[PDB]
Amino acid sequence: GSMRTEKDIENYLKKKTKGLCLKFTSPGTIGVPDRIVVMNTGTFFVEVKAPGKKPRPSQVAMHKKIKEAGQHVWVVDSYESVDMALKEMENW
Amino acid sequence: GSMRTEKDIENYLKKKTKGLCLKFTSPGTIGVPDRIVVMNTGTFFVEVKAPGKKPRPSQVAMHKKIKEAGQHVWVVDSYESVDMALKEMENW
Ligand SMILES: [Mg+2]
Ligand SMILES: [Mg+2]
């Protein structure tokens, strides 16, 4: 019925980001994170999931490539987790 | 005839990046940089131009938004400028 969805979480991330929260598409590459947050401390990758939903294996594989190149990826699935992710970025 | 083009410069950037060099598209937003370089020191924006060509005003306006949010944007238009940009990122 009225449980929050992935799109709700994504809209909340956009609202709370102090900086830019740009949609990220990368033609030809599978599984890239939904958003790139641009703020004073860095540009950060964020994948948004519906409450309780894990990234698919193709998404995890892409996150691993990002981590191997040396950067982190946040996965958010609730307003609380959005708040925590943004706070961590603000303290990076 | 055989002068390097924007695509040549972009291919060279991809070849020389120590990390990921992901195509960046952001549906609904005009003028975003061509590529996001992911390496140990950060995730960085790069716009690629043909030799001697300046970013269009809509691209400059987007770069300004990125800079106001607190991050830099590199503009590369030659193999030399690619080398210099990547070296600066490796030293970030
Ligand atoms: Mg998602
Ligand atoms: Mg270009």
Numbering used by the authors:
A (entry chain A), B (entry chain A): -1 to 90
Question: Could you pull the original sentences from the published paper?
Answer:
stNUC was solved by single-wavelength anomalous diffraction (SAD) methods on crystals of selenomethione-substituted protein and refined against native 1.3 Å resolution data. One molecule is present per asymmetric unit (AU) and comprises a central four-stranded β sheet surrounded by three α helices in a αβββαβα topology. The protein crystallized as a dimer with monomers related by a crystallographic 2-fold axis and interacting through a substantial hydrophobic interface formed by the central β sheets of opposing molecules and bounded on either side by the α2 helix from each partner. Electrostatic surface representations highlight the position of the negatively charged active sites on each monomer, which bind a single magnesium ion in a geometry that is distorted from a classical octahedral arrangement toward a square pyramidal configuration. K47 is presumably involved in positioning the catalytic water molecule as would be expected from homology with other members of the restriction endonuclease-like superfamily (Knizewski et al., 2007). PsNUC bound a four-way DNA junction stoichiometrically with an affinity indicative of a subnanomolar equilibrium dissociation constant (KD) typical of HJRs (∼1 nM; White et al., 1997) whereas stNUC bound the junction over 100 times more weakly (KD = 200 nM). Nevertheless, in both cases, the binding was structure-selective, with psNUC forming weaker complexes with a 5′ flap and a nicked three-way junction and stNUC binding the four-way junction only. stNUC and saNUC exhibited weaker nuclease activity against the Jbm5 HJ substrate, detectable only at protein concentrations above 1 μM and with increased reaction times. Under these conditions, stNUC showed robust activity, whereas cleavage by saNUC was much reduced. In both cases, we observed a range of symmetrical cleavage sites within or close to the homologous core of the junction as well as some nonsymmetrical sites away from the branchpoint. stNUC also selectively cleaved a nicked three-way junction (RF) and a 3′ flap structure (3′F) 2 bp 3′ to the branchpoint.
However, we were able to solve the first VRR-Nuc domain structures using single-domain proteins derived from three bacteria and bacteriophage as surrogates: Psychrobacter (psNUC); Streptococcus equi bacteriophage P9 (stNUC); and Salmonella enteritidis typing phage 3 (saNUC). Crystal structures of three representatives show that they structurally resemble Holliday junction resolvases (HJRs), are dimeric in solution, and are able to cleave symmetric four-way junctions. DALI searches show that the structures with greatest similarity to the VRR-Nuc domains are all Holliday-junction-resolving enzymes exemplified by Hjc. As dimers, bacterial VRR-Nuc domains have two active sites and a DNA-binding surface with 2-fold symmetry that are well suited to the recognition and symmetrical, bilateral cleavage of Holliday junctions.
